[PDB]
């Protein structure tokens, strides 16, 4: 029955198997700032928090995407014959996949796959996306039918993200559409539009009833997070925790749990990278994610205020919103106050003065090579007057803080916008990447230049600057002299 071939795929929404949550959430997902690792599994520094991750790690998003999205994929599409609900989600589900492979190593195969055969041909960053936006807009077309009939029958059996109300669906694809089109929105700014536009006209999400999360956790009714953290190989970021607590954030209870390695209290981070090579146990007692708390806790995918912060920015680029900037920056705090049960929006909001906080770690001795000063000066309330890069630092900042815990989020707005300001490495361990900006990207992995050698090499000649590198610019990223 290809509904039930549905929810292996489902596993690309929030990666709720313990180690596909380590692969995904928490390794390279570090550049976005939210969850550190602090294991170095015996590689001291020639780690991904360096920028210098093996090759085994580097390749691991690449196998447990791939591994989750095909062959089902194709299984579905051969048995629905390309119709119906039961093939909306499988395409959905494989364009959600893979616009996060894209958004890691740039060119990925996709149009020129086929039932089986390992040597696809590469799609460039262009064609992928433009592809993927196909793809996803055939879904749409079908999911807007089926929702006029009411919650569908077949779906409700294995969906556990809205038992099979493709009303949240449709919602959910057009966000994805409009977070899709503000991603190449630099590259592509007249293509972006149309599609941001067309998104929302279509339906974003627009309350906390709407936002997804992996309910099950994949049916194994416990979430991966808890288990990572419990080993302990993740804890919270420096970045997000000081920026937070500069912020007095009245979000911190509901996103980190106090540090006890000391009687201080308050939160205190990790820092991503740090002076010295990090080690689980010494960071044992620094603050956990809350949602490792609870292993009954399901993995979120998608929240309602994303929608809200996307339209903001789409309003500062003068693009067609249905609302202006402002309006959306405080729909989007006040969504994210909501969807965590916390109070004091209103005087969050109007903040003036409370700046990024500096991150110091004094809990274990010797850790003061950690410390860093905060490069953003940006403050909560909204500010009419203020200039073009400050109204965008502020809704790219809260919507950082919003979509948490977000893998991806942080790191690409970030290489995108220069904003949110990441916290970089102590240091690169990789001559193609220095700490100014990090990271740039994953590479292809040894199992295509092992197995589909004559078409990866052909796709080292469409990246940007020619190079198989973690520095090398992805398509829609702000290339080192500013421009797209
Ligand atoms: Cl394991
Ligand atoms: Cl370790
Ligand atoms: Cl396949
Ligand atoms: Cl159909
Ligand atoms: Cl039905
Ligand atoms: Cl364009
Ligand atoms: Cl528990
Ligand atoms: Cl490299």
Redesign the pocket.
Known sequence: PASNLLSTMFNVYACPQQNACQEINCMWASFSGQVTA?????FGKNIFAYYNASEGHNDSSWGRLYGYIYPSFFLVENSTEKKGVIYAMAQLTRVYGMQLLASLQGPIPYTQMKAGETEAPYDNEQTVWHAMFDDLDNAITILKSAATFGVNQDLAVVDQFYKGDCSKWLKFANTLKLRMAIRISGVEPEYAQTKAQEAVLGGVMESVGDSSYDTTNGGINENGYAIVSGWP?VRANACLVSYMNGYNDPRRPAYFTPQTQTAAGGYVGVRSGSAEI???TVYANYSKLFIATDKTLPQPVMYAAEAAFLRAEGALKGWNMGGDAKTFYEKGVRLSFEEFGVSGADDYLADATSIPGNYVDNLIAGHTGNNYTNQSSITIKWEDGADDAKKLERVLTQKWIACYPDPMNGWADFRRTGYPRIFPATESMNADCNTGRGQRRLRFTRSEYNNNKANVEAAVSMLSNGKDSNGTDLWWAMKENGTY
């Open positions: 602090t294991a170095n599994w015996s190989e990090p080690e689980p």
